[PDB]
Design a protein around this ligand. Structure first.
Ligand code: HEM
Ligand code: HEM
Ligand SMILES: N=C(Nc1cccc(OC[C@@H](O)c2cccc(NC(=N)c3cccs3)c2)c1)c1cccs1
Ligand SMILES: N=C(Nc1cccc(OC[C@@H](O)c2cccc(NC(=N)c3cccs3)c2)c1)c1cccs1
Ligand SMILES: [Cl-]
Ligand SMILES: [Cl-]
Lengths: 362, 362
């Protein structure tokens, strides 16, 4: 069955991919090659064209992603050649550098060797390549609570955080054959961060908030034509609400709404005053203002929804079915001010796509 | 099959209802009575206890309703005795009066005779008993665009609106046997309205906004034990976001966000300024402030979500499965500031319940 699963997925992907690339005539011969290759080796190897277009299709098929208008401009870096942890580390360093691009963020994915027999060649432990540590002990809460389990795992391996609210976690990954992952501290020169200030409320800087420029998701599996690329970190730029309405706002994250209320000069005492809503607006204004002022790419939710509308239109014009997850596509503030809220979406799963996979720790 | 559908639904409802009422012992005999009655007449008649509890269960089962904590305190008015249009009209007038209760709103439902052979005895045309007219002609848009089709239908029947932005539509309903519905102007003394002012922005009154106190949904079918009560208007009080984030905010409703932005002194030019979000917060603050100041019941979305959390807990403690529609339960502003956003809900349909039915016009 496993071989057959591979072959069925391969057939489907190659036909669709080559059709999109105007390579329909080459489908028959390529399929035979793949079929022979699966018979002889138990798998097959993507051409660079297949890999690149596969990663793009996967983004295009990501139901939960509002940023899909730009799917075809994804920068795909083929690192199926890596064999050593130094090569992996350097590839991750490089991804950070080239994706960051001095603040003009380039949507980028680096693709490492795929699983062989369900056996990972490279196993990335980070949730994002750049993320803050979190600590919890004896009433004391420091940093990002979402990172507590990974932080504890790193500290088991000899890493030690300074215990600021914004410690950069090291890169941490394991190679096939090794019992333990290795870790490497991030060079600060590679990591752009943005201090959060408000366009007209001077006291906002008293909160000493900041966030990192580039979100680089590194724990999802890219599946293309039955091949499982468990290690394939990708990035875009942020939508502002991710930072201002979730990372800094959530009670189980940085939980800053009461402090925001205080610095903007409103009471945080009565639900009917809508102080949380007001704090959310000002914090989100501050986030967009700060990224723009520094020259780090970001998009607001209104602009992002407008871009997504064009993606919907483009899909229709191309004769492609549109899939989406309404519950993730609506922004977490003012959702009914976007067109997304007022329509429905088919949440069917189409491949290629990006998938969750079990954590290697905890 | 139709008889059998009735009998199956009856069996299920009576067992559950009587179990909840501690009347489990009386189930067997009541079922026989009903069974005989269905054989002889093609239907059956609810006891007042069954009717009252049925309407309450229906609210309790309404997946989309955040206000369900208070399901058991619904005031059920049995008007299965009405036979004339004057009796219907007076019953609707009465519902308005008693539900309004000088502003201390009482959740209330008035139940009219049920469908006989799918044949309605009373057919209500209004979407809500109290709602504003809408007009569209030659570039000119007046009032509530959502009411345009019903307004046009009323004007076919000899009613004429003053064409303010807030004309009260007449009650309009049809009796079995009549080709045309009848209409009756609402006595203004029965209709409480609230002018919208802001707690600290004096200019907000320049917008001359207002809304009606009591939303009374009159176009849904109450289904209890296989009986179809197509005419059974019900009300609660408003959650503030319904008025401030939808009725007054939606581009296809009153579309007031640009005007709100102007009176609160912010530019409405750049998406990144989040002026729509800011306008939404101030408009929603104004709505809550105004209803509270006048002494008309209303609930904010934070308080409503907290009440819904208790409903969830109460359901668990009672051994009842919880059903809900996440997409309607989240409020349309700051949804991620509520617990609802961060969990999932089973959207299964349980009866008794309230259902959509086709409009008798358009
Ligand atoms: C270019 C800018 C991009 C923006 C602004 C953007 C925006 C977003 C946002 C806001 C989410 C939802 C996260 C949340 O609500 O918590 C999301 C989800 C997602 N995006 Fe994008 N995205 C972009 C690019 C990309 C790229 C380049 C990829 C992959 C090649 C991608 C794949 C995804 C996936 C897989 C998810 C869902 C994650 C999950 O299910 O947990 N996006 N995107
Ligand atoms: C007591 C105060 C109540 C509040 C604050 C409340 C709140 C709400 C809200 C906010 C909605 C969603 C509307 C929207 O988002 O557009 C809703 C839906 C609903 N409520 Fe309640 N509700 C209350 C009482 C009731 C009562 C008394 C009933 C019936 C006996 C009821 C039945 C429903 C139904 C059927 C819906 C769904 C309508 C649809 O699917 O179109 N609610 N409620
Ligand atoms: N947003 C939700 N859940 C949620 C909860 C906790 C964390 C979380 O992180 C998304 C984070 O892992 C993530 C994943 C994918 C993309 C992003 N954001 C980005 N801009 C990009 C990262 C990489 C490419 S684009 C961020 C998402 C919900 C919607 C409805 C109910 S709950
Ligand atoms: N809220 C949504 N849709 C929507 C669109 C237009 C009108 C509308 O009116 C609800 C209105 O008919 C209605 C129905 C039932 C209850 C209420 N509000 C109330 N407080 C009550 C009326 C009667 C008892 S409680 C109001 C709802 C959506 C959620 C997610 C995607 S779209
Ligand atoms: Cl994030
Ligand atoms: Cl309404």
């Amino acid at each position: 069955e496993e071989k057959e699963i591979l072959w069925n997925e391969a057939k489907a992907f190659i036909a669709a991919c080559y059709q999109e690339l105007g390579k329909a005539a080459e489908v028959k011969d390529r399929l035979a090659d793949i079929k022979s290759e699966i018979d002889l080796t138990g798998s097959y190897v993507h051409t660079k064209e297949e890999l690149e277009h596969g990663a793009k299709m996967a983004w295009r098929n990501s139901n939960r992603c509002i940023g899909r208008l730009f799917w075809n401009s994804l920068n795909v870096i083929d690192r199926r050649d890596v064999r050593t942890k130094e090569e992996v580390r350097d590839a991750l360093f490089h991804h950070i550098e080239t994706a960051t691009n001095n603040g003009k963020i380039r949507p980028t994915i680096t693709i490492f060797p795929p699983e062989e027999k369900g056996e990972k060649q490279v196993e990335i432990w980070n949730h994002q390549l750049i993320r803050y540590a979190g600590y919890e002990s004896d009433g004391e809460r420091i940093g990002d609570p979402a990172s507590c389990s990974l932080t504890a795992a790193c500290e088991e391996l000899g890493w030690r955080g300074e215990r600021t609210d914004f410690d950069l976690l090291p890169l941490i990954f394991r190679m096939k054959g090794d019992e333990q992952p290795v870790w490497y501290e991030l060079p600060r020169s590679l990591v752009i961060e943005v201090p959060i200030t408000h366009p007209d409320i001077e006291a906002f800087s008293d909160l000493e908030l900041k966030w990192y420029g580039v979100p680089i998701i590194s724990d999802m599996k890219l599946e293309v034509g039955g091949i499982h690329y468990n290690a394939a970190p990708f990035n875009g730029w942020y939508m502002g609400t991710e930072i201002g309405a979730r990372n800094l706002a959530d009670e189980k994250r940085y939980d800053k709404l009461k402090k925001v209320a205080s610095v903007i000069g409103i009471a945080a005492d009565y639900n009917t005053d809508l102080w949380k809503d007001q704090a959310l607006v000002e914090l989100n204004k501050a986030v967009l203002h700060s990224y723009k002022k520094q020259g780090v790419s970001i998009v607001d939710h209104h602009t992002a929804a407008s871009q997504f509308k064009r993606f919907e239109e483009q899909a229709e014009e191309a004769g492609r079915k549109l899939t989406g997850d309404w519950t993730w596509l609506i922004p977490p503030i003012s959702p009914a001010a976007t067109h997304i809220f007022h329509r429905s979406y088919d949440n069917s799963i189409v491949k290629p796509n990006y998938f969750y996979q079990d954590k290697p720790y905890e």
